[PDB]
Design a protein around this nucleic acid. Structure first.
Lengths: 799, 793
DNA sequence: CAACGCATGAGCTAGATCCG
DNA sequence: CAACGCATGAGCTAGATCCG
């Protein structure tokens, strides 16, 4: 047969040889097989155990710290292929730290599909270089066989096989002293082969029985089906673990085996593209009965069935299993017995839930002030209830002042009863507002929710405050609200002014952050103003808020304050929040202006947008200046050592970009470049200080050398005068003419003429000239460098 | 008289001219006089007002933004002297941002005692450079007169007195166009002077009526006594405000006017060294009846008389008023309605208080931990009681678990009643421990302190856990305690292991209150162990801690944990804390290894102690080696362009002397503790140094002989230094003829090696003088003898 | 009679209807 | 019968009486 034996799950053996007994009849082992850490095991109980029918291994084989095995060929006589479907530690087969292993014995391996082999730290193995991994392993660039007994060539290495020449040597490759590694002709690479060199059927591997038959060889390639195997089996069956395909009656049971959540090593198996896969991936969720996966229009829930029907969340890690879960099929109870700060972390841990079916009880909650962490709650089913048929439960909580923001939120409880007892910091109108947004209207117990033990310790307020005049500047805003008095004008402590900046308008109401936590509202208090006994008076109390960064939206509100006493009045008043943006001003400086010179007439300049914009900037303002050369360099004797080598004002309104090039300018000239960032213009044209950079453009190739009639005059004392013309536009400035004269047979002897020496003389001279035929050649060396040479002018003075 | 008028406290005037009316009869203004910020004042309201009797100013005179004045002489006709006892803004007289001041008018100013004058931003002033400030003030370097109308020389400067020559010019010095600055002869400096040059009595200043009399000049120097003034008045009187002295009957009344604490401009005046001073300073405290000041052995209390009998404490700022008080003369109430973290700041703010006279009330305490911030409480008097005659009050505090550690604390309560209601986390036995340390034993009200609303929500524990075996490594510590089971061994959640390091043993205990702490006991939890139904089994549970630093004392304890139920049993158990130090290991590397070379032989070397000592380091271990010469210099033509040790103990620096001169040396050093068991020495750090040349070993002595060849090329033969400083690289070889200078030549290392000497090609025949100097790589040396040889023509 | 002038704007002297 | 050996010591394989 192909695989006549039994399927067999991946196992693990430790500290005994007892649980190796369950490999009696299984032939293919999906998963992996790790046997590790046996210590009190003699070498004698291995010479009678064997497993003759074992062939297929999917993931890896790992033998690690075994004491008593000397040759594992007596345990694995017939395994041929390792699929390598899961890598272990970036390896596929690892034998490690064997203490009594004489020889390996893996003489029947044919094709490692994926991965590499690793053998370390074994002072008892030989024949390790007689394997020819290159004929089994497709990738030998990951092999790692170091620190063994064959670190020194000392163990014999004799064996009775082709003795292949894969390297430059006639290396003989044997497994044991009784077996060589089998190599037949390479006319078919991995197609399976015989002892007589006949290649077997194209779709199988390894050991073979009859050639060119897909029904009686051993280990085939892609899949397997009932004694046959084709590369893509037809879809009465769907592929499974990339080595089989099977009818959907089979693997629909395994989905129902661990729908009973008893082992989390399984997967809720789904059908997708004829692959009974663990999970159809992101952008896909499963349907109920057909076991397919649905293209998941928008976000699809990833339902999260709760364990044991209920749960209590008390810290971070109890809720950290709940991250990503959206629909919960049970009941939840929150209880933060103290705690420092959860008000920042529940949104990243549980702030994406929408659906629960049981009941939500809060109790003993110390540092919770709102329920704004429940961002996406819309419906509670209430299928299971608390005793007395209760669905929402609140008891003995000391800081709860808000439940939700009912202006922008929706919540419905289908059945059950709400509960609110001994919750002294939440006013009675809120749970009345909670009653109207929910489904229940008259479902009360009598006694229902406690009307006296809730909100008694907290003065909930019923009056509003409006502003009167708001004023802007670039730095300071101004507030002045309408006056107020309590019904006793003596009992008044003043007001508090809460403010913070706001980039958006999804800003919370005063959530009452009183425990530990993040950024609260920064606040200053106000001395209560003077009584005047007049209706028209200066009773409007003002305050200046000063230290504000400009061009930023800022939110404000003001709250009353009163002492606590026996009378249940003078509740105070509370303003509503608004939004006020400050004005803008002069902006910041530009950043990093970069000048690059490519040609003599192109000069590109790029900068970076400014650090502080202070409003939408309209454009940029640029200015340049044509620099001047140094006038003190004109009077230097340049044949003394030291020669130099360098490297309104018009404008444009550059808009909507980041760089600009300027053309039409002088060659090899320095330029001081300054540019201003500047906001809106036709009212209050106001710009920053310019960033200043320097720039010199490229020189021109012919501006250095001069052409002209080089005429000469011979005097009576053999001092020949020389007249020529200067460069009209030098690259910066001419500094020295390399005047040189050459007699035939004599070298190019050079002289000097300075800038002022050429200026005073209008040429040069040559004193003490020997009579002959000389050739005078000049090079005009400017400050940008040397020019070209002139024509070597011929003149002959005779004896 | 000397000062006939009246004393006058320092006033401030703003927004009007009405409150100058109270200066009608006073003559000396102690303090300062600031008149500032009037706007709705015409320039014509001043010409009918003056103050003819003003003489002395103690601190400063400040005129700032006055609209309507034009000349100060209309108001201050007799203003003479400024004492400058307090400097405003580091100046003594400031006339600033005046708008209509044409000319100054202050002409009688004689002596500024301390400070300088500042006139700024007045573009209507003239004659400002006609003052001669050096003959009024004693310091002129700190003067600052800038940006006036005299920024340009434009206002005339015409004036009818010496026109002195203090600078290089004949500058005229005068105040107005009608008066000039008066300077008499300098035979006496500031001793008072007449118009006729007669110097007055030695102890006064300024204007004067009759000379050489201490009774009828005007402004005198040190003090003042009844028309006379002597430089130190006898102690029937005590000096006051450094310008007067007076009997003790005077300033004992101002001490009693101040004890009616109606203004914080007080100074509780005490007598000290005949000076009725504001405060006798630190190291001194006043006595009650005698009004002197006592030398204050130890810290003396600086008593803190609390206002309106009581006070509330809720934040960082209400307690910041009472920093540095020890005794409080009233009752105190605290109420911490939440907050974030206030445990770490109370000892910095109020941890030095000792005594309370009234009563102490705690209500609505939310986020407290203990009362250990009250470090030095020992007694509460209870001179005021609460309603129902109550002295201690704790009510509705939802977290409190520990009052004090009574083993290291003493506290008493004289009278009153204690109150403990609705404090559900504090054990009932702690108040019984509070009852026995207090003064009261059986003064109960019935109903007294609540025995039911306190301790119900928190099971205070009554059983202890002992340890069984501790083991230490250099990095890990192993812990194992005796087993424990509740009376129901199903109800058990495990244990908690709190630990933190501690350099001392004054460690806070666990209390079990939430206050939002930066440092805390870091904790891991333990799975509860297996039940085995055997007394002798492996029921001792263990845990290993690993992430520690070596050689550090560490404190540990373990607490039980159980579910909350309705039966009032299974409270749990709590171990007692102990201390366990880790072991020591191989230490770190020493730091900052610096070696300096001062001579050719001495090498001083200095380092630092290591960053990680890991125990008491016993000694050090040094190793030096003889660095070899760089042999790559052997081929450069320079005519072109075991190891000895010592166990150094108990010091930080070491010198290595008595060794071979001019050799480079690589030296290393190790730091390590004890040796003969567990030989533990650390890694080494390496230095390098280079030394100085010698005097005579670089120079070679020897017969510089010459061999004469026939081609006028005389050979030269001498010897090389057998021990130079390192390596001889160039012999400064030279030859000198009569009338010629010492003409030099050069020779490399190989050239003297290949030839064994030198030559001189194409030599003029004469009596030459051949002298060689040895110039090694470290510098030059001495010359040899200039050798004479006379080749003939 | 509804910003600017007869100050500056958070560096021991007031604190933006604070002033008319 | 009271540290070492027949591992390492917090880098998908156990977690310091974890194995005797």
């Amino acid at each position: 047969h192909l695989y006549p034996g039994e399927v067999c799950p991946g196992m693990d053996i430790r500290n005994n040889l007892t649980r190796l007994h369950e490999l009696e009849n299984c032939s293919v082992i999906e998963g992996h097989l790790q046997i590790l850490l046996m210590f009190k095991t003699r070498p004698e109980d291995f010479r009678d155990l064997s497993f003759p029918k074992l062939i297929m291994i999917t993931d890896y084989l790992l033998l690690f710290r075994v004491y008593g095995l000397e040759s594992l060929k007596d345990l694995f006589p017939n395994l041929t292929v390792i699929r390598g479907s899961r890598l272990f530690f970036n390896y596929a087969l690892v034998i490690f730290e064997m203490v009594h292993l004489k020889e390996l014995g893996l003489y029947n391996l044919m094709n490692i599909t994926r991965g590499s082999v690793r053998i370390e730290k074994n002072n008892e193995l030989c024949y390790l270089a007689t394997i020819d991994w290159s004929r089994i392993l497709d990738s030998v660039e990951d092999n790692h066989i170091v620190l063994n007994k064959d670190d020194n060539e000392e163990c014999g290495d004799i064996c009775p096989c082709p003795a292949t020449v894969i390297n430059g040597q006639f290396v003989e490759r044997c497994w044991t002293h009784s077996h060589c590694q089998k190599v037949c002709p390479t006319i078919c690479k991995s197609h399976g082969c015989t002892a007589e060199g006949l290649c077997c059927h194209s779709e199988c591997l390894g050991n073979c029985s009859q050639p060119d038959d897909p029904t009686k060889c051993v280990a085939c390639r892609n899949f397997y089906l009932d004694g046959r195997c084709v590369e893509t089996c037809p879809p009465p069956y769907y592929h499974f673990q990339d080595w089989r395909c099977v009818n959907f009656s089979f693997c629909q049971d395994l989905h129902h085996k661990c729908k009973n959540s008893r082992r989390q090593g399984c997967h809720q198996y789904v059908i997708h593209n004829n692959k009974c896969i663990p999970e159809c991936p992101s952008g896909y969720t499963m349907n109920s009965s057909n076991l397919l996966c649905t293209p998941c229009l928008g976000p699809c829930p990833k339902v999260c069935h709760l364990l044991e029907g209920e749960k209590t969340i008390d810290s971070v890690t109890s809720a950290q299993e709940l991250r990503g879960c959206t629909v919960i099929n049970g009941s939840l109870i929150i209880n933060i017995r103290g705690g420092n700060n959860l008000a920042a972390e529940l949104e990243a841990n549980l702030g994406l839930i929408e659906e629960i079916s049981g009941y939500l009880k809060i109790r003993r909650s110390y540092a919770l002030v709102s329920l704004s962490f429940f961002r996406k709650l819309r419906l509670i089913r209430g299928e299971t209830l608390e005793i007395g048929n209760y669905s929402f439960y609140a008891l003995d909580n000391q800081n709860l002042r808000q439940l939700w923001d009912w202006s922008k939120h929706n919540l419905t409880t289908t059945q059950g009863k709400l509960f609110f007892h001994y919750n002294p910091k939440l006013c009675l109108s809120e749970i009345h507002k909670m009653e109207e947004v929910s489904g229940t209207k008259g479902r009360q117990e009598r006694n229902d929710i406690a009307l006296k033990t809730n909100g008694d310790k907290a003065s909930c307020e019923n009056e509003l405050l409006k502003f009167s005049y708001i004023r802007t500047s670039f730095d300071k805003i101004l507030l002045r609200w309408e006056p107020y008095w309590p019904p006793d004008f003596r009992d008044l402590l003043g007001f508090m002014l809460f403010y913070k900046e706001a980039p958006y308008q999804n800003v919370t109401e005063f959530d009452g952050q009183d425990a530990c936590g993040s950024n609260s509202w920064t606040v200053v208090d106000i001395d209560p103003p003077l009584r005047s006994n007049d209706p028209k008076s200066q009773n409007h109390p003002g305050w200046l808020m000063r230290g504000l960064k400009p061009w930023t939206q800022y939110a404000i509100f003001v709250k009353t304050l009163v002492t606590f006493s026996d009378e249940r009045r003078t509740y105070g008043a509370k303003s509503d929040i608004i939004y006020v943006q400050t004005d803008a001003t002069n902006p910041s400086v530009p950043l990093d202006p970069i000048s690059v010179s490519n040609s003599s007439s192109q000069i590109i300049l790029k900068w970076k947008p400014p650090s502080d914009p202070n409003g939408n900037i309209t454009h940029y303002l640029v200015f340049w200046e044509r620099q001047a050369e140094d006038s003190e360099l004109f009077e230097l004797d340049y044949c003394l050592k030291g020669l130099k080598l360098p490297s309104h004002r018009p404008f444009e309104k550059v808009v909507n970009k980041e760089s600009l090039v300027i053309s039409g300018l002088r060659h090899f000239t320095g330029y001081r470049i300054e540019l201003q960032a500047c906001n809106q213009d036709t009212p209050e044209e106001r710009c920053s200080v310019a960033a200043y950079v320097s720039a010199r453009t490229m020189p021109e190739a012919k501006a250095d050398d001069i052409v002209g009639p080089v005429t000469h005059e011979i005097f009576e004392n053999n001092v020949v005068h020389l007249m020529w013309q200067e460069p009209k536009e030098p690259n910066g400035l001419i500094v020295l003419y390399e005047v040189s004269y050459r007699r035939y047979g004599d070298e190019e002897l050079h002289l000097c003429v300075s800038r002022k020496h050429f200026a005073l003389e209008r040429g040069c001279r040559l004193r003490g000239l020997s009579p002959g035929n000389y050739s005078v050649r000049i090079r005009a060396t400017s400050l940008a460098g040397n020019g070209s040479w002139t024509e070597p002018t011929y003149f002959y003075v005779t004896d």
